[PDB]
């Protein structure tokens, strides 16, 4: 039988590239989305056309809030994402924690608050609950029926040790996700679940600024003097999920073109 | 003329030693507590006896939850009022030590878990963020000519979290976040000359609620002295980092672990 | 056909790296110091699979002068890179794998130990990288390869130092520095410089059981496959980074 | 009883500040120098004037080369530095590995040049510290327990910025990486003898406007005292639970990005 990957925030950009990369290796893919229903469903369509019954889409707000049905908690919503894989395909072999909100939370001058739950939920708390659910399902599976290549990838940030000015909550949340990578790798090793991180520097940079400014930022990357393509990140995620990487756990791989080696 | 330090979770153990260490250097100290009212008030008494009007106590749950007042009171508001208490009482707040911290297992493998999330993440990460925000807002709001000359924020982190304690995921995640806060705040608050640094104990003031051989077993693994640290062995470092001699240090984490993080299984 | 230079290629991890690269279509220059038999045997196997796809070169990578004026380590390193160019006209990949490893205790010979441990693990890699880079720079842009990659074999565990191994540990620390410095300086020439750090691999029960994942040391392939990936064009945005291949061993504490 | 500190490259700048800081705490200080005899001797004079017999000077090339007397090896020269403390004062409590050469060794465009460069940069920054630590430890081990000092401390002067390497400075950067490894390895091995081994890493200090303005805190390089005071604290008994750690003294400079 065919292995299953759950990719959060899979609709576009890096998540899509990760979903596509995994699909190209033969994985059936559960495509999580929050607001990008159209893009997610379009991606599912493409993948199901190449290979029937190889893609589904699930909607979830991964912010640390209760939602409307008692109210539904984030944990419950995370458990149902993993469950959707089991209900549809009877398994979940790979989890990619990719979904992530990203915007300023300045230290210096119902916003703020919202911001805390959105940024911490998507980047840190939801990944925790998702890993918990993922692990619970593997533990609950009889050893003889388990998959042979369980892999969890956390999308971190190569640059957060050189924090982006005004992005504290985001930076804090990636710090937490790094901790989750290490703690989960240790605790889930007995179940042969590998937990690793991939950290982009600058990838698929949006040109929503003066062209010369866009160019200024990307030119700072020592290698190629440009931001990465989506595939340049996703191919690494795909390798780490492959059985050739089966001795790697608890580690974060920078995919940053040497950007973290720079100084002001 | 007397500088003011806010120390969270100041009632006992490391927080108390930090409060005492800062007080010994001339600081007036605002002693935060959650459940340890007796201990906090006793400590305040001792310090006020040595030096009148050099200690106060404030109560606050630093968990990421709304509390009862009218509208519910958010964590952010509660954090702001901690900083405000220093300004109301002494007209200043020069040092913040994010020490308060909950610490217990949140296993990945087999109502509870949810209060756990808000308690562990609130105390270790979210409250420090809001506390730093409030601290910084008050400095920015103070006219340059009236500002203190040695602003210092110390976050109590963990020297061992890169070698995670089995079953302590949320706690470990939260310290990870606090490390991020240290670095991000240091960069952003540098223009205001607010230094933000971390102190990371390994094993300190270990309590023996286990067979003696097991207790001795844990402490013997520390390469230096084969023992856990005293409270002062940690707090003295916090105090140095707050001193003006350490005024070029910001955004860094100092391990106080007797070489424990150098070990392997 | 692209060319890889693998130092200490005769056995264990170096052999697995040489084999892994060869399986991807690389011609491979197999460096050895004392293991002539093993190196030549490996060359034979590879040349049998694919004619003219393997050669062997001998060099002491210790920081000493050797007999011919005496020959310096730098010269010896330059000749290793040169051997690739003389034979195949190119050198696309360099894997700094050769490494001596033994106690240099601080608490109760020592001088050859310093030159051996520091030379193989740090100084020779530096000279090798220098020579490698010089040859790429000297090649006209239109004739250059499209996937230049240098991999340094580091150690996942050296931040948790092995008791009594100071010089070795120092040397890996230097090799890590080399990885970062070289990655930055050679970026304009599109030469990627990265590190792979094993924890416990191909151990010659108590020790291996401490590895959280699988409770065993790794196989050679479990390390070499990662080296091979980093050399592939799919990894072309990775430079200046070290990848631990340690089954979570560096996450442990006493 | 008067404790003794050996400070390498003690003649000027940070080393001098470290020597002065330690002396101000009551230490007798052995001032190592290579080429700066005048400055070293002038510093010794000042310190001996404040407190008779509290300073001496010793000359040594800490480069990884043999010198003229059989030729004298670096190891021997390092052992004699530690020995000089014992001969003069009967003890050596603190070692500060401060001496360091620092200049470009470019990977991209004189063969003898590059070779003395290797031995000079690696010797001073890494190999000599190793031998110095070895000698230092040997002397403590050889001292009967009842006669040992109570606050043994070795400080290695590292670099806060080497993870963001200075372009063209490979050998130097490699050597600091080695010194970091030495700090960690020595801390572990020498823990049983209660010898603490730590690192201090400046970012930009006592620079000889564009460069200094990049430091987030104060937008300037540090003073010598802003670094040396930290070295002094780490050697104090209040820091006696700190070992195997590197303290950045960089005004947040390592937090920056291009
Ligand atoms: N791009 C870079 O240069 C860069 C650099 C460093 C690290 N990274 C990391 O790499 C990963 C992917 O990068 P990216 O640029 O592709 O990310 P992105 O486009 O900014 O976000 C990816 C997806 O996350 C989902 N998301 C955001 N908030 C959510 C929430 N509260 N609940 C549920 N889903 C939410 C969104 O889904 P919907 O659209 O469906 O709403 C979005 O499509 C992220 O984890 C990021 O932190 C990226
Ligand atoms: N001790 C060690 O071996 C060790 C090791 C590594 C790191 N650390 C770090 O060093 C710091 C102090 O260590 P410690 O052992 O002295 O800590 P601790 O005794 O376990 O906790 C300190 C105080 O934190 C307060 N606290 C806990 N949860 C709170 C909440 N939800 N809201 C408000 N206050 C809360 C408690 O105050 P009340 O008693 O008033 O309720 C407690 O007295 C901590 O940040 C810890 O993470 C310690
Ligand atoms: N094995 C592990 O558990 C482990 C763990 C961490 C890191 N590593 C790293 O991974 C790499 C390979 O590991 P390994 O176990 O395969 O290494 P290894 O067997 O101990 O050594 C590999 C080769 O290095 C060569 N070599 C040693 N000293 C030399 C010198 N002075 N001049 C020239 N060549 C010299 C030897 O070549 P000859 O036989 O021809 O003389 C030897 O075959 C090393 O860099 C090591 O540091 C390995
Ligand atoms: N200054 C900074 O911005 C900065 C930044 C990062 C790290 N650091 C570190 O902090 C330490 C001190 O900094 P600094 O700027 O004061 O250093 P420095 O002035 O450049 O050098 C200090 C001393 O090292 C000695 N020295 C150099 N090569 C030697 C050799 N081959 N043998 C014996 N002695 C040798 C010299 O002694 P003589 O004059 O007697 O010949 C020199 O006075 C160094 O370890 C450095 O790496 C400094
Ligand atoms: C108002 O709009 C603008 O013009 C601003 C865009 C943000 N700005 C940047 O400099 C900036 C810094 C880092 C960036 N990245 C690292 C790219 C990027 C893009 N999307 C992301 N998404 C997530 N979730 N996480 C990331 N780290 C992430 N990162 C992008 C822009 C300032 C200008
Ligand atoms: C029942 O079996 C279990 O599940 C194990 C969990 C950990 N156990 C400990 O005894 C224990 C006690 C103290 C420890 N420390 C690291 C000391 C300590 C004590 N209080 C603290 N408080 C806070 N806030 N943060 C800390 N890092 C902290 N650390 C570690 C393990 C019991 C064994
Ligand atoms: C000739 O050497 C000797 O005198 C022996 C002394 C006792 N040894 C070990 O117990 C020991 C400890 C750790 C080991 N490993 C972590 C495996 C290993 C085996 N070979 C290696 N070779 C190199 N070059 N580098 C390594 N890190 C390396 N690592 C292996 C043996 C080392 C071998
Ligand atoms: C012979 O030397 C030369 O060729 C010059 C070339 C131009 N230089 C600089 O721009 C430069 C770059 C960085 C600097 N610093 C980070 C300050 C500094 C000054 N002296 C030092 N000395 C040592 N030993 N180590 C250091 N890290 C060190 N650092 C100083 C000057 C260095 C001096």
Instruction: Give CA–CA dist B76/C192, Å, rounded.
Output: 46
Instruction: Give CA–CA dist C30/C45, Å, rounded.
Output: 12
Contact D168/C185 with Cβ under 8 angstroms? yes
Sign, Cα dihedral of D236, D238, D242, D245: negative
Which residues, 6+ apart, have CB-to-CB distance to D4 below 8 Å?
Answer: D27, D28, D29, D30, D85, D89, D91, D92, D93, D94
Question: A83 CB under 6 A from ligand 5?
Answer: no
Contact C127/C120 with Cβ under 8 angstroms? no
Alpha helices in chain C (DSSP H): 12-23, 36-49, 73-88, 110-118, 124-138, 166-186, 220-231
Instruction: Give CA–CA dist A243/B159, Å, rounded.
Output: 33
Burial of D148 from C-beta contacts in 10 A (0-12 / 13-18 / 19+): middle
Burial of A109 from C-beta contacts in 10 A (0-12 / 13-18 / 19+): exposed
Phi and psi at C156, nearest 5°, equal: -65, -20
3-state class (DSSP) for residue A108: coil
As given in the structure block, the two tokens for residue D168 are 């063209």
Sign, Cα dihedral of A5, A11, A15, A21: positive
Chain centre to alpha carbon of residue D205: 15
Contact D196/D205 with Cβ under 8 angstroms? no
The residues with which A7 forms a beta bridge, in sequence order, are A31, A96
Sole residue written with tokens 């918990």: A132
Sole residue written with tokens 């209040």: D238
Instruction: Give CA–CA dist C242/C236, Å, rounded.
Output: 14
In chain B, which residues have their Cβ closer than 8 Å to the Cβ of A183? 108, 164, 168-169, 172-173
Contact A97/A38 with Cβ under 8 angstroms? no
Centre of ligand 7 from the C-alpha of residue C58, in Å: 23
Which residues, 6+ apart, have CB-to-CB distance to D7 below 8 Å?
Answer: D15, D18, D19, D22, D29, D30, D31, D32, D96, D98
Instruction: Give CA–CA dist A126/A120, Å, rounded.
Output: 8
DSSP secondary structure code for residue C208 in this structure: G
DSSP secondary structure code for residue A73 in this structure: P
Q: Give, in degrees to the nearest 5, the angle at Cα B111 between B107 and B117.
A: 55
Contact A195/A131 with Cβ under 8 angstroms? yes
Candidates C223, C234, C248; nearest CB to A235 = C234
Q: How far apart are the first and last CA of chain A?
A: 52
Please compute, for residue D227, the number of CA atoms within 13 A of its CA located in the half-sphere on the CB side. 30
Contact D249/D203 with Cβ under 8 angstroms? yes
Which residues, 6+ apart, have CB-to-CB distance to D201 below 8 Å?
Answer: D157, D158, D159, D160, D161, D162, D246, D247, D248, D249, D250
Q: Give, in degrees to the nearest 5, the angle at Cα C133 between C57 and A264.
A: 140
Quote helix, strand, coil % in chain D, to nearest 5.
45, 15, 40
Instruction: Give CA–CA dist A113/C31, Å, rounded.
Output: 60
As given in the structure block, the two tokens for residue D9 are 């490259």
DSSP secondary structure code for residue C222 in this structure: H
3-state class (DSSP) for residue C102: coil
Q: Give, in degrees to the nearest 5, the angle at Cα C14 between C11 and C16.
A: 85
Sole residue written with tokens 């890179």: C81
Q: In chain A, which among 146-185 make CB contacts under 8 A with chain D?
A: 159, 161-163
Helix (H) or strand (E) holding C5: strand C3-6
Phi and psi at D61, nearest 5°, equal: -85, 115
Which residues, 6+ apart, have CB-to-CB distance to A229 below 8 Å?
Answer: A203, A204, C237
Q: b or e along D178-214 (b: 16 or more beta carbons within 10 Å of the residue's beta carbon)? A: bbbbbbbbbbbbbbebbbbbbbbbbbbbbeeeeeeee
Contact C133/C144 with Cβ under 8 angstroms? no
Chain D interface, mutation test: which of C94, C181, C190, most D Cβ atoms within 10 Å?
C181
Helix/strand/coil (H, E, C) string of C163-178?
CCCHHHHHHHHHHHHH
Contact D217/B193 with Cβ under 8 angstroms? yes
Question: C10 CB under 6 A from ligand 3?
Answer: yes
The residues with which B75 forms a beta bridge, in sequence order, are none
Question: C229 CB under 6 A from ligand 7?
Answer: no
DSSP string, D99-150: --------S----THHHHHHHHHHIIIIIHHHHHHHHHHHHHHHS-GGGS-S
Which residues, 6+ apart, have CB-to-CB distance to B74 below 8 Å?
Answer: A113, B66
Number of H helices, E strands in chain D: 7, 7
Q: Which strand ranges, in their side-by-side order, compose the sheet holding D196-202?
A: D55-59, D28-33, D4-7, D94-97, D153-157, D196-202, D246-249
Neighbours of A66 (CB within 10 A): 14
Cα dist. C87→A264, C10, D28 in Å? 44, 19, 63
Strands (E), D1-138: 4-7, 28-33, 55-59, 94-97
Q: What is the CATH number of the domain that holds C194?
A: 3.40.50.720
Sign, Cα dihedral of B92, B96, B100, B106: positive
Instruction: Give CA–CA dist B111/B142, Å, rounded.
Output: 43
Burial of A208 from C-beta contacts in 10 A (0-12 / 13-18 / 19+): exposed
Strands (E), B80-213: 95-98, 152-156, 195-201
- Considering only the C-alpha atoms of chain B, give the largest distance between any 2 of them, rounded to a whole number of Å: 58
Q: For chain B, after which residues does the C atom lie more than 2.5 Å from the next written residue's N, i.e. where is it broken?
A: 69, 110
Beta-strand relationship, B55-59 and B28-33: parallel
Burial of A41 from C-beta contacts in 10 A (0-12 / 13-18 / 19+): middle
Q: b or e along B130-150 (b: 16 or more beta carbons within 10 Å of the residue's beta carbon)? A: bbbbbbbebbeebeeeeebee
Chain centre to alpha carbon of residue A106: 25
Contact C65/C44 with Cβ under 8 angstroms? no
Q: Do C171 and D180 touch (CB under 8 A)?
A: no
Instruction: Give CA–CA dist C151/C202, Å, rounded.
Output: 20
Neighbours of D113 (CB within 10 A): 9
Contact C179/C125 with Cβ under 8 angstroms? no
As given in the structure block, the two tokens for residue D150 are 């109570």
DSSP string, C240-254: S-EEEESTTGGG---
Q: Quick one: which of B156, D29, D177 has its CA closest to C169? A: D177
Q: Quick one: which of D228, D233, D239, D247 has its CA closest to D18? A: D228
Burial of C163 from C-beta contacts in 10 A (0-12 / 13-18 / 19+): middle
Crossing angle for the helix pair B37-50 and B13-23, to the nearest 10 degrees: 20
> In this structure, which ligand is nearest to the CA of C63?
3
The residues with which C135 forms a beta bridge, in sequence order, are none
Contact A248/C244 with Cβ under 8 angstroms? yes
Sole residue written with tokens 């190119």: C90
Alpha helices in chain A (DSSP H): 13-24, 37-50, 74-89, 111-120, 126-140, 168-188, 211-218, 230-241
Contact B62/B8 with Cβ under 8 angstroms? yes
Contact A155/A98 with Cβ under 8 angstroms? yes
Sole residue written with tokens 């104090």: D236
As given in the structure block, the two tokens for residue C2 are 């692209």
Please compute, for residue B85, the number of CA atoms within 13 A of its CA located in the half-sphere on the CB side. 23
How many structural domains are present in chain C? Answer: 1
Active site residues of A: 170
B98 CA closest ligand 2 atom index? 45
Q: Do A260 and D257 touch (CB under 8 A)?
A: yes
Instruction: Give CA–CA dist B47/B68, Å, rounded.
Output: 31
Chain C interface, mutation test: which of B165, B168, B226, B264, most C Cβ atoms within 10 Å?
B264
Q: Resolution of the deposited coordinates, in angstroms? A: 2.6
Instruction: Give CA–CA dist C63/C119, Å, rounded.
Output: 4
Question: A20 CB under 6 A from ligand 5?
Answer: no
Candidates D122, D167, D189; nearest CB to C166 = D189
Q: Quick one: which of D93, D102, D130 has its CA closest to D7? A: D93
Q: b or e along B204-235 (b: 16 or more beta carbons within 10 Å of the residue's beta carbon)? A: bbeeeeeeeeeeeeebebbbbbebbbebbbbb
In chain D, which residues have their Cβ closer than 8 Å to the Cβ of B194? none
Neighbours of A217 (CB within 10 A): 14
Chain centre to alpha carbon of residue C250: 21
Chain centre to alpha carbon of residue C201: 15
Instruction: Give CA–CA dist A120/A125, Å, rounded.
Output: 6
Cα dist. C65→A60, C104, D115, D120 in Å? 66, 22, 12, 17
Contact D65/D123 with Cβ under 8 angstroms? yes
Phi and psi at B43, nearest 5°, equal: -65, -40
Q: For chain C, after which residues does the C atom lie more than 2.5 Å from the next written residue's N, i.e. where is it broken?
A: 68, 108, 204
Contact A64/A76 with Cβ under 8 angstroms? no
Burial of C33 from C-beta contacts in 10 A (0-12 / 13-18 / 19+): middle
As given in the structure block, the two tokens for residue B115 are 């209060």
Q: Do B183 and D255 touch (CB under 8 A)?
A: yes
The residues with which A252 forms a beta bridge, in sequence order, are A197
Q: Quick one: which of D130, D100, D98 has its CA closest to D19? A: D98
Q: Give, in degrees to the nearest 5, the angle at Cα A64 between B73 and A17.
A: 155
Contact B8/B100 with Cβ under 8 angstroms? yes
Helix (H) or strand (E) holding C198: strand C192-198
Centre of ligand 2 from the C-alpha of residue B12, in Å: 9
User: Which method was it determined by?
Assistant: X-ray
Q: Which strand ranges, in their side-by-side order, compose the sheet holding A252-255?
A: A55-59, A28-33, A4-7, A94-97, A150-155, A193-200, A252-255
Specify the long-range contacts of residues B10-15, CB closer than 8 Å, at least 24 apart. B10/B40, B10/B43, B10/B99, B11/B36, B11/B39, B11/B40, B11/B43, B12/B36, B12/B39, B13/B204, B13/B205, B13/B231, B14/B99, B14/B156, B14/B201, B14/B204, B14/B205, B14/B231, B14/B234, B14/B235, B15/B97, B15/B99, B15/B100
Q: Which strand ranges, in their side-by-side order, compose the sheet holding C149-153?
A: C54-58, C27-32, C3-6, C93-96, C149-153, C192-198, C242-245
Instruction: Give CA–CA dist D81/D30, Å, rounded.
Output: 9
Sole residue written with tokens 């424990």: B260
Q: Do D181 and C169 touch (CB under 8 A)?
A: yes
Sole residue written with tokens 């508001």: B77
In chain A, which residues have their Cβ closer than 8 Å to the Cβ of B179? 175
Number of H helices, E strands in chain A: 8, 7
Instruction: Give CA–CA dist D122/D145, Å, rounded.
Output: 34
Chain centre to alpha carbon of residue B64: 16
CA dihedral of residues A62, A68, A73, A76 (deg, nearest 10):
-80
D172 is catalytic: yes
As given in the structure block, the two tokens for residue A5 are 């990957």
As given in the structure block, the two tokens for residue B41 are 């008030």
The residues with which A101 forms a beta bridge, in sequence order, are none
Domain enclosing residue C182, as ranges = 1-254
């Amino acid at each position: 039988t065919v292995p299953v990957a759950l990719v959060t925030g899979a609709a576009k950009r890096l998540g899509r590239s990760i979903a596509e990369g995994l699909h190209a290796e033969g994985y059936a893919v559960c495509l999580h989305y929050h607001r990008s229903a159209a893009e997610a469903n379009a991606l599912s369509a493409t993948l199901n056309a190449r290979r029937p019954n190889s893609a589904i889409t699930v909607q979830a707000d991964l912010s640390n809030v209760a939602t409307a049905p008692a109210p539904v908690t984030l944990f419950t919503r995370c458990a149902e994402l993993v469950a959707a894989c089991y209900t549809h395909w009877g398994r979940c072999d790979v989890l990619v924690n990719n979904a992530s909100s990203f915007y300023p939370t300045p230290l210096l001058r119902e916003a703020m608050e919202t911001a805390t739950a959105d940024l911490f939920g998507s980047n840190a708390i939801a990944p925790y609950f998702l890993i918990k659910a993922f692990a619970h399902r593997v533990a609950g599976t009889p050893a003889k029926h388990r998959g042979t290549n369980y892999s969890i990838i956390n999308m971190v940030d190569a640059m957060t040790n050189q924090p982006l000015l005004g992005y504290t909550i985001y930076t804090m949340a990636k710090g937490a996700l790094e901790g989750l990578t290490r703690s989960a790798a240790l605790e889930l090793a007995p179940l042969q679940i590998r937990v690793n991180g991939v950290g982009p520097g600058l990838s698929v940079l949006v040109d929503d600024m003066p062209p010369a400014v866009w160019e200024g930022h990307r030119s700072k990357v020592p290698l190629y003097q440009r931001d990465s393509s989506a595939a340049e990140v996703s191919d690494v995620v795909i390798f780490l999920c492959s059985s050739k990487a089966k001795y790697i756990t608890g580690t974060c791989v920078k995919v940053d073109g040497g950007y973290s080696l720079t100084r002001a």
